[PDB]
Structures are given as structure tokens and as C-alpha cells.
Amino acid sequence: NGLTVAQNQVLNLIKACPRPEGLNFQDLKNQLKHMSVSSIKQAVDFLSNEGHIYSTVDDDHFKSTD
């Protein structure tokens, strides 16, 4: 899909979560234990800007764009 392994790791987790509130940054850290905070943030920022994910009504959680 053009995304890097890191970007896909983050996107796949967000996609795989059907909960209405989505995943927060702590959830990402907890599930991507081999990825640094900076690397996760880098991937999230990219996915957000590209439009693959968005921040929910709650200012700190992430969901996949349908």
C-alpha cells in the first residue's frame, strides 16, 4: 500500500480496533513494545497527515478512516 513496515504496524493496530473510542498513544506503546515513543509518534503524524487515521471526538484517541 506504499506504507513502510513501521507505518503499517501502527495503521494495522488502529484498523484492528473496533472499539468506539479508538486507541490512544499508550495503547500503541503497549502493543508495539519494540517501537520507541518517537517512532510511534512519527508514524502517527504521517498517517494523520496523509488521512489514513484521525483523532476522535476525544482529543487523544485514533481511528482508521473508512
First to last CA, the chain: 16
HSE (side-chain half, CA atoms, 13 Å) at 36: 3
Report phi then psi at 56, rounded to 5. -70, -175
Domain of residue 60: give its range.
Answer: 1-66
Q: How far apart are CA 14 and CA 10, in angstroms?
A: 6
Query: How many other CB atoms are there within 10 angstroms of residue 30's CB atom?
Result: 10
Q: How many domains does the chain have?
A: 1
Helix (H) or strand (E) holding 46: helix 37-50
C-beta of residue 13 within 8 angstroms of C-beta of residue 31? yes
CATH code, domain carrying 20: 1.10.10.10
Report phi then psi at 43, rounded to 5. -65, -45
Which cell numbers hold the place of 52?
489514513
Between vectors from CA 17 to CA 53 and to CA 15, what angle results, nearest 5°?
40
Closest CA to 63 of 30, 16, 29: 16
N residues, the chain: 66
By what method was this entry solved? X-ray
Tell me, what DSSP letter sits at residue 45? H
